[PDB]
Enzyme design. Structure first.
Site, PDB file in Angstrom:
ATOM      1  N   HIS A  72     -24.759 -12.502   9.284  1.00 11.44           N
ATOM      2  CA  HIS A  72     -23.948 -11.566  10.099  1.00 11.44           C
ATOM      3  C   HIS A  72     -23.525 -10.380   9.226  1.00 11.44           C
ATOM      4  CE1 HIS A  72     -21.689 -10.144  13.540  1.00 11.44           C
ATOM      5  NE2 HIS A  72     -21.816 -11.277  14.203  1.00 11.44           N
ATOM      6  N   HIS A 124     -21.813 -10.867  23.071  1.00  9.24           N
ATOM      7  CA  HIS A 124     -21.344 -12.149  22.533  1.00  9.24           C
ATOM      8  C   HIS A 124     -19.859 -12.019  22.147  1.00  9.24           C
ATOM      9  CE1 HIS A 124     -20.955 -15.783  20.149  1.00  9.24           C
ATOM     10  NE2 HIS A 124     -21.091 -15.211  18.964  1.00  9.24           N
ATOM     11  N   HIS A 152     -23.037 -19.617  15.131  1.00  6.75           N
ATOM     12  CA  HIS A 152     -22.905 -19.061  16.473  1.00  6.75           C
ATOM     13  C   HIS A 152     -22.584 -20.078  17.532  1.00  6.75           C
ATOM     14  CE1 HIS A 152     -24.257 -16.004  19.620  1.00  6.75           C
ATOM     15  NE2 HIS A 152     -23.918 -17.109  20.274  1.00  6.75           N
ATOM     16  N   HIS A 159     -22.859 -16.418  10.177  1.00  7.58           N
ATOM     17  CA  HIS A 159     -22.088 -16.833  11.368  1.00  7.58           C
ATOM     18  C   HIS A 159     -22.700 -18.078  11.949  1.00  7.58           C
ATOM     19  CE1 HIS A 159     -20.105 -16.664  15.314  1.00  7.58           C
ATOM     20  NE2 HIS A 159     -21.176 -16.203  15.964  1.00  7.58           N
ATOM     21  N   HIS A 174     -19.456  -7.997  20.867  1.00  5.85           N
ATOM     22  CA  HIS A 174     -20.458  -6.953  20.575  1.00  5.85           C
ATOM     23  C   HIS A 174     -21.782  -7.275  21.196  1.00  5.85           C
ATOM     24  CE1 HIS A 174     -22.770  -9.473  17.659  1.00  5.85           C
ATOM     25  NE2 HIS A 174     -21.583  -9.957  17.339  1.00  5.85           N
ATOM     26  N   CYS A 175     -22.656  -6.244  21.279  1.00  8.83           N
ATOM     27  CA  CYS A 175     -24.030  -6.518  21.777  1.00  8.83           C
ATOM     28  C   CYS A 175     -24.783  -7.274  20.661  1.00  8.83           C
ATOM     29  CB  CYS A 175     -24.710  -5.174  22.027  1.00  8.83           C
ATOM     30  SG  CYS A 175     -26.429  -5.493  22.568  1.00  8.83           S
ATOM     31  N   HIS A 176     -25.516  -8.326  21.070  1.00 10.40           N
ATOM     32  CA  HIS A 176     -26.221  -9.124  20.067  1.00 10.40           C
ATOM     33  C   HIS A 176     -27.643  -8.614  19.814  1.00 10.40           C
ATOM     34  CE1 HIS A 176     -26.774 -12.627  17.492  1.00 10.40           C
ATOM     35  NE2 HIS A 176     -25.634 -13.190  17.887  1.00 10.40           N
ATOM     36  N   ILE A 177     -28.023  -7.455  20.368  1.00  3.10           N
ATOM     37  CA  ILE A 177     -29.218  -6.736  19.852  1.00  3.10           C
ATOM     38  C   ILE A 177     -28.748  -6.184  18.502  1.00  3.10           C
ATOM     39  CG2 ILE A 177     -30.865  -4.814  20.187  1.00  3.10           C
ATOM     40  CD1 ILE A 177     -30.568  -5.451  23.302  1.00  3.10           C
ATOM     41  N   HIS A 228     -28.419  -2.564  17.717  1.00  5.04           N
ATOM     42  CA  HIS A 228     -27.303  -1.880  18.407  1.00  5.04           C
ATOM     43  C   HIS A 228     -25.931  -2.145  17.771  1.00  5.04           C
ATOM     44  CE1 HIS A 228     -29.891  -1.934  22.334  1.00  5.04           C
ATOM     45  NE2 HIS A 228     -30.444  -1.221  21.347  1.00  5.04           N
ATOM     46  N   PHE A 269     -22.081  -0.807  18.235  1.00  4.31           N
ATOM     47  CA  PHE A 269     -21.815  -1.284  19.609  1.00  4.31           C
ATOM     48  C   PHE A 269     -20.954  -2.553  19.610  1.00  4.31           C
ATOM     49  CE2 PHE A 269     -24.157  -1.589  24.101  1.00  4.31           C
ATOM     50  CZ  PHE A 269     -23.009  -1.036  24.725  1.00  4.31           C
ATOM     51  N   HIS A 309     -17.011 -13.905  19.959  1.00  2.00           N
ATOM     52  CA  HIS A 309     -16.743 -14.933  18.940  1.00  2.00           C
ATOM     53  C   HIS A 309     -15.489 -15.722  19.312  1.00  2.00           C
ATOM     54  CE1 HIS A 309     -19.428 -13.535  15.442  1.00  2.00           C
ATOM     55  NE2 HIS A 309     -19.761 -12.755  16.466  1.00  2.00           N
ATOM     56  N   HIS A 330     -27.911  -5.133  27.684  1.00  2.00           N
ATOM     57  CA  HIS A 330     -27.244  -5.510  26.457  1.00  2.00           C
ATOM     58  C   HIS A 330     -26.598  -6.896  26.579  1.00  2.00           C
ATOM     59  CE1 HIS A 330     -27.761  -1.420  24.967  1.00  2.00           C
ATOM     60  NE2 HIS A 330     -27.280  -0.974  26.128  1.00  2.00           N
ATOM     61  N   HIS A 355     -26.940 -17.557  11.556  1.00  2.00           N
ATOM     62  CA  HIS A 355     -27.688 -16.353  11.183  1.00  2.00           C
ATOM     63  C   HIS A 355     -26.865 -15.486  10.279  1.00  2.00           C
ATOM     64  CE1 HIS A 355     -25.496 -13.814  14.286  1.00  2.00           C
ATOM     65  NE2 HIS A 355     -25.658 -14.855  15.087  1.00  2.00           N
TER      66      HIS A 355
HETATM   67 CU   LIG Z   1     -27.467  -3.590  22.998  1.00  2.00          CU
HETATM   68 CU   LIG Z   2     -25.025 -14.968  16.989  1.00  2.86          CU
HETATM   69 CU   LIG Z   3     -21.254 -11.462  16.126  1.00  2.60          CU
END
Ligand SMILES: [Cu+2]
Ligand SMILES: [Cu+2]
Ligand SMILES: [Cu+2]
Ligand SMILES: *[C@@H]1O[C@H](CO)[C@@H](O[C@@H]2O[C@H](CO)[C@@H](O[C@@H]3O[C@H](CO[C@H]4O[C@H](CO)[C@@H](O)[C@H](O[C@H]5O[C@H](CO)[C@@H](O)[C@H](O)[C@@H]5O)[C@@H]4O)[C@@H](O)[C@H](O[C@H]4O[C@H](CO)[C@@H](O)[C@H](O)[C@@H]4O)[C@@H]3O)[C@H](O)[C@H]2NC(C)=O)[C@H](O)[C@H]1NC(C)=O
Ligand SMILES: *[C@@H]1O[C@H](CO)[C@@H](O[C@@H]2O[C@H](CO)[C@@H](O[C@@H]3O[C@H](CO)[C@@H](O)[C@H](O)[C@@H]3O)[C@H](O)[C@H]2NC(C)=O)[C@H](O)[C@H]1NC(C)=O
Length: 496
Positions: free
Chosen positions: A111, A397, A66, A64, A449-452, A455, A460, A399, A394, A109
């Site tokens: 994905h 992000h 980002h 991805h 979604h959460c970018h952790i 998760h 998530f 897209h 959390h 990164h």
């Molecule tokens: Cu999270």
């Molecule tokens: Cu990203």
């Molecule tokens: Cu993503």
């Protein structure tokens, strides 16, 4: 940096960024992954050549870019099983896209699953030849990118499902408690010059509280959106966020500590962990002995505003949009849920489901995780924090879009007139109700979604299916994309 037309050849090999040797993912034979650069409006042609042979860190991959909107190139956005099947080992795949009307600091990164944690992640800068903030600085180049990253001595699929970092890396270097003599990153400045530093979080999980002894920072960009300048003396940066800040090297020639305190793992600076060195030309090449002053001017997100004074989409009243959606977080059976549903990746990528004949969001898999969005509409999404989703705060992000943060974490106010815009936002802690707005100008399925990354792996996420009827016409896919799923589905499970 490299690009905007270049190969990115992915492989596995040994690295030792904190003095501990482990197998990890290399990009063009480099760890950390190299900086990609171009200018506003350029065409990027990034040929990803997948030579990985280690199934523990996944042989297949998808990347991805980002922060790029990918208008008309939704197939290049990167999320595995949303926008493409993974690239298979022994194959290449060309991401070919343009970046009209964006300029700032981005990153790339993996994905696929939690693969970026194993090292496939690097910064991107898109320069603006008429950058409206240029007159604030003298130097902006490969040496003024500052990356922050978590690093683990066990690989993503080898350690705990939600691991704890052994080191913070700054530009790919740092110390762990067992490696207190490892080389620290050095960032060079010359007294009397002004620097645009581009701070990028490549983190898989922790956020970092960033400061530089003896210096202040003038923040001028957040997540690729130009801001009115704001002086701060510390920045809490969440996973996947970016900020540009100007540093005036107007202190005594010497060495100053650069500090990046994580919210988890080892949180002190003993022995120079969580640290790097700001070195003025003419200083002794030794470690700083500076001491930290408490922050009196921390960055506050609700106080940031865009350079151009952009209003939030819609009417300046709660619910004053075409479609308002509340996302209720939870946790069930060891997975995260949003409005009762956990995302599990589908066998057929969401974009390919649309292109194969799914005509509305109700027809798309996974059932419960996909939201229809109408074209040319104002959308408001609220993401109220809750301890029911463990590991808060959390950072979510979206897209395909930048969004106005009408209500930030730790603030009770709503700003429709001139809120900051960005693309990753902390959803904060119980009591918060972080609320964002965006306009649907970009047909395609887009992840939210959460970018952790641990998760996301535990479900998530949801998918925003934006203007399904126009998706095929607006996003003509290339032949190489059509070949990804048949090639991927033919692999033995141990070669994925
Ligand atoms: Cu999270
Ligand atoms: Cu990203
Ligand atoms: Cu993503
Ligand atoms: C694919 O990617 C994954 C994830 O990154 C790699 O997974 C790693 O697996 C190993 C094996 O389970 C994990 O265990 C640790 O391995 C390290 C590194 O070992 C290497 O380097 C050593 C030199 O310092 C060397 O001695 C090793 O060689 C021996 O082992 C190999 C393979 O079995 C064998 O063929 C040789 O003949 C040798 O016998 C190897 O080259 C190792 O240092 C660790 O040992 C410590 O911990 C154990 C207790 O856990 C203890 O017994 C030791 O005394 C010492 O304290 C430990 O074995 C490793 O953690 C995984 N890495 C990550 C990042 O998770 C995987 O290896 C990759 N595959 C390939 C082919 O590269
Ligand atoms: C976080 O903010 C969101 C958005 O403001 C809050 O959701 C909104 O909550 C109110 C109820 O308190 C809903 O208003 C009600 O709508 C119903 C049905 O249309 C109506 O019959 C009632 O008279 C009332 O107006 C509103 O619909 C709801 N919005 C959405 C989009 O779901 C949310 O409760 C806040 N959460 C927290 C924890 O603060």
């Amino acid at each position: 940096g490299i690009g905007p037309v270049t190969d990115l050849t992915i492989s596995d090999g040994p690295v030792s960024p904190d003095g501990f040797t482990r197998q990890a993912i290399l990009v063009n034979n480099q760890f950390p992954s190299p900086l990609i650069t171009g200018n506003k409006g350029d065409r990027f042609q990034l040929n990803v050549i997948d030579n990985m042979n280690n199934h523990t860190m996944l042989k297949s991959t998808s990347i991805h870019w980002h922060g790029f909107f990918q208008h008309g190139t939704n197939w290049a956005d990167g999320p595995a099983f949303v926008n493409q099947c993974p690239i298979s080992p022994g194959h290449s795949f060309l991401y070919d896209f343009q970046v009209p009307d964006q300029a700032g600091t981005f990153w790339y990164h993996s994905h696929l699953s939690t693969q970026y944690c194993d090292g496939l992640r690097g910064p991107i800068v898109v320069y603006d030849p008429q950058d409206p903030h240029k007159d604030l600085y003298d130097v902006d180049d490969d040496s003024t990118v500052i990356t922050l990253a978590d690093w683990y001595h066990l690989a993503a699929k080898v350690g705990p499902a939600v691991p704890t970092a052994d080191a913070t890396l700054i530009n790919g270097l740092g110390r762990s408690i067992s490696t207190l003599n490892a080389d620290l990153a050095v960032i060079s400045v010359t007294k009397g010059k002004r620097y645009r530093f581009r701070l990028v979080s490549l983190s898989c999980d922790p956020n970092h509280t960033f400061s530089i002894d003896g210096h202040t920072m003038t923040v001028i960009e957040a997540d690729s959106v130009n801001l009115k300048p704001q002086v701060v003396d510390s920045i809490q940066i969440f996973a996947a966020q970016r900020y540009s800040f100007v540093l005036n090297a107007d202190q005594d020639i010497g060495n100053y500590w650069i500090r990046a305190m994580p919210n988890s793992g080892t949180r002190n600076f003993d022995g120079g962990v969580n640290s790097a060195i700001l070195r003025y030309d003419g200083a002794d090449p030794v470690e700083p002995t500076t001491t930290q002053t408490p922050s009196s001017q921390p960055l506050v997100e609700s106080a940031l505003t865009t350079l151009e004074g952009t209003a939030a989409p819609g009417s300046p009243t709660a619910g004053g949009v075409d479609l308002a959606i509340n996302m209720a977080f939870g946790f069930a059976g060891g997975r995260f849920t949003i409005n009762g549903a956990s995302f599990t990746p589908p066998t057929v990528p969401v974009l390919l489901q649309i292109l194969s004949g799914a005509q509305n969001a109700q027809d798309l898999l996974p059932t419960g995780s996909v939201y229809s969005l109408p074209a040319n509409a104002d959308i408001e999404i609220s993401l109220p924090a809750t301890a029911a989703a463990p590991g808060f705060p959390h950072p979510f992000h979206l897209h395909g879009h930048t969004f106005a943060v009408v209500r930030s974490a730790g603030s009770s106010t709503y700003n429709y007139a001139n809120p900051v815009y960005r693309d990753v936002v902390s959803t904060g802690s119980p009591g918060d109700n972080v609320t964002i707005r965006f306009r649907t100008d970009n047909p395609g399925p887009w992840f939210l979604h959460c970018h952790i990354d641990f998760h996301l792996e535990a479900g998530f996420a949801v998918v925003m299916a934006e203007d399904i009827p126009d998706v095929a016409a607006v996003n003509p896919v290339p032949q190489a994309w059509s070949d990804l799923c048949p090639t991927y589905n033919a692999l033995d499970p141990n070669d994925q």
